[PDB]
């Protein structure tokens, strides 16, 4: 029947979107994805009663919002403390060593690039994207659902036949250098406001009231974690949770690594610092996390921040000189 044919084309598109944006390993040429997007759109136009709200053709709201509504996160987020030196980082490891009851040998960290963008939270209900918000201050943010729906590597439907009852994906939205340079060039040509750096371009784009404008902004999500998680037994380490997010079609940064012990973690920090803008987008620092979730829970938090993670920040771009 027509409905099943429609759903088979949409499923095919969602698989190509996963391969291209999440796996970075497309199985078909762009031209095939393009023509299939056209074919789906033509069939939906012939049968509009079968349009679905999570179809690949439905990313872009037709009208601008009047303003952003405030959102209170259902589960507030911790704040993240910063380290700026190797001594600060080693002090943070030592506090863990001094607090854990049974200190494993080695102590594994999941180590991530800290994307220079805007932090966001995206809620999927029985697999469907239903709302998204800015992180804000970790307690209150703004509802940016219509903007987040435009982002090409953000799935509208999770890639699984058995999605959690509810899943909150937390991540950073950023704008790679090439897109950022195109945006600034377009803006100057039209005498519209430009952006001082990609971080501000990503933040300003996510506060664009008209999602037709936001769709033209080349934004990318990289997920860093999970809040609400109902009807799902999540893996017991953070890195396996990230691999699981990838498995269901959520984009995660490919430079994340497991590191054993303080010294390997500093190896990671120095390596990503060397790559802080050679990968085609800006990385602000690293977020270094105890990988084992039971150890995270044991370690807890103080003053709003986990004892089990630290952001070891690079020097600001303006400190980098001859
Ligand atoms: N090889 C692959 O599997 C694959 C998968 C996803 C994206 N891509 C590539 O990524 C690039 C960026 O993709 P993008 O999402 O910005 O789209 P885009 O704006 O670059 O458009 C890509 C194609 O999709 C068509 N299209 C876009 N929105 C449509 C809609 N609502 N209805 C009907 N057709 C629509 C366009 O006419 C165009 O032919 C494109 O070059 C695309 O081919 C490739
Ligand atoms: P940025 O300074 O835009 O980050 C703001 C807050 O978001 C949370 N956060 C961002 N990135 C990460 C990762 N990779 N892991 C965990 N938490 C992250 C932190 O609360 C940042 O302070």
XYZ file of C-alpha atoms in Angstrom, residues 80-92 95 114 266 269-270 273 276 284-286 288 310-317 319:
33
model
C 31.689 21.487 35.086
C 34.843 22.722 36.842
C 37.926 23.787 34.847
C 41.631 22.963 35.021
C 44.200 25.121 33.297
C 47.454 23.300 34.124
C 48.962 19.799 34.387
C 49.246 20.389 38.161
C 45.494 21.155 38.349
C 44.632 18.060 36.359
C 46.888 15.809 38.515
C 45.334 17.287 41.686
C 41.851 16.370 40.307
C 41.347 13.666 44.823
C 35.129 19.947 24.311
C 47.718 14.064 29.535
C 45.063 16.418 26.164
C 48.359 17.351 24.413
C 45.570 20.521 21.844
C 42.562 22.193 18.323
C 38.028 24.712 23.348
C 39.713 22.000 25.555
C 38.932 18.487 26.672
C 38.043 14.148 31.028
C 37.032 18.089 34.761
C 37.297 20.399 31.679
C 41.012 20.874 31.033
C 40.834 23.993 28.873
C 43.366 25.068 26.257
C 44.708 28.626 26.302
C 42.319 31.076 24.584
C 42.955 31.617 20.819
C 47.049 33.819 23.715
